[PDB]
Design a protein around this ligand. Structure first.
Ligand SMILES: CC(C)n1ccc2ncnc(N[C@H]3CC[C@H](N(C)C)CC3)c21
Length: 277
């Protein structure tokens, strides 16, 4: 299974869990730190009720032990002697940050965006084939390696027509039934639909200083002929073509069906994204 790391080894390779940003070991905020084990760069997540957090720690390791795939983040180890999770470092960060060009990275081309959408769908397919529900599909949870290969991340909420008293996930990406407490892989499809809109538009899922505030509402604007998908295509690309953009939008629109049973399954989503290219 997985190797244990001494808390002190992790402390020592993250410069005593140096909370200062890399620019000034903090990569994100528990808190994620950049570490170095031998000649390998790693991501160290230091977890921050206490009982609930230990359950999330145990659950995540359990999901990672079972779910190994090219389009899923790989867990390298853990520490429980304070809780830490050690992952393969993704040098190109999240899809959210690449879409926003955070820290001055160049915009992603339409070509790269198509590969990332296909890769992300492949990762979700592996999860659904293996009877797992992610529960928090979003662009911040799609990481990018050295070749911009999409890697589904954050299995802290992952579960193996069921209800819950503890509604979890990210509101701007959640399916109506998920907001009501239902647990289903059909909700992961809906959230993926929002990610596809982020890829087409380059816009965040929610923006308080925007009309509409929620990205998913652009589907209604397009359906009611108030706007076109053309109007919303990210202007930070030079290689997008109407045919493939409309093909990705058709997939996003199908994923975003309000009625869970009318949405395509992940295998259909993969097929449609393959046909697009
Ligand atoms: C699962 C996650 C902890 N993880 C696993 C491997 C890995 N490698 C690099 N970064 C990661 N997380 C970043 C958090 C901060 C994010 N922004 C700057 C806000 C960008 C992504 C990684």
């Amino acid at each position: 299974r997985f190797h244990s790391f001494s808390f002190y080894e992790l402390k020592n390779v993250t410069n005593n869990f140096d909370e200062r940003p890399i620019s000034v070991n903090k990569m994100g905020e528990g808190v994620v730190y950049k570490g170095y084990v031998n000649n390998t760069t790693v991501a160290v997540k230091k977890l921050a009720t206490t009982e609930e957090l230990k359950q999330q720690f145990d659950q995540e390791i359990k999901v990672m032990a079972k779910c190994q795939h090219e389009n899923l983040v790989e867990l390298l180890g853990f520490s429980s002697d304070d809780l830490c999770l050690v992952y393969v470092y993704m040098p190109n960060g999240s899809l959210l940050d690449r879409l926003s060009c955070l820290d001055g990275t160049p915009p992603l081309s339409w070509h790269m965006r198509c590969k990332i959408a296909q890769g992300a769908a492949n990762g979700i397919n592996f999860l659904h084939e293996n009877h797992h529900i992610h529960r928090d599909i979003k662009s911040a949870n799609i990481l990018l390696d050295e070749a911009f290969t999409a890697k589904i991340s954050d299995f802290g909420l992952a579960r193996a027509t069921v209800m819950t008293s503890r509604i979890v996930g990210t509101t701007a990406y959640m399916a109506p039934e998920a907001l009501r407490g239902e647990i289903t892989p059909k909700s992961d499809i809906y959230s993926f639909g929002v990610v596809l809109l982020e890829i087409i538009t380059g816009l965040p899922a929610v923006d308080e200083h925007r009309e509409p505030q929620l990205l998913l509402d652009i589907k209604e604007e397009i359906e009611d002929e108030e706007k076109t998908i053309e109007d919303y295509i990210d202007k930070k690309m030079n290689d997008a073509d109407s045919t493939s953009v409309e093909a990705m939008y058709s997939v996003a629109s199908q994923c975003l069906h309000e009625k869970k049973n009318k949405r395509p399954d992940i295998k259909k989503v993969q097929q449609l994204l393959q046909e697009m290219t």
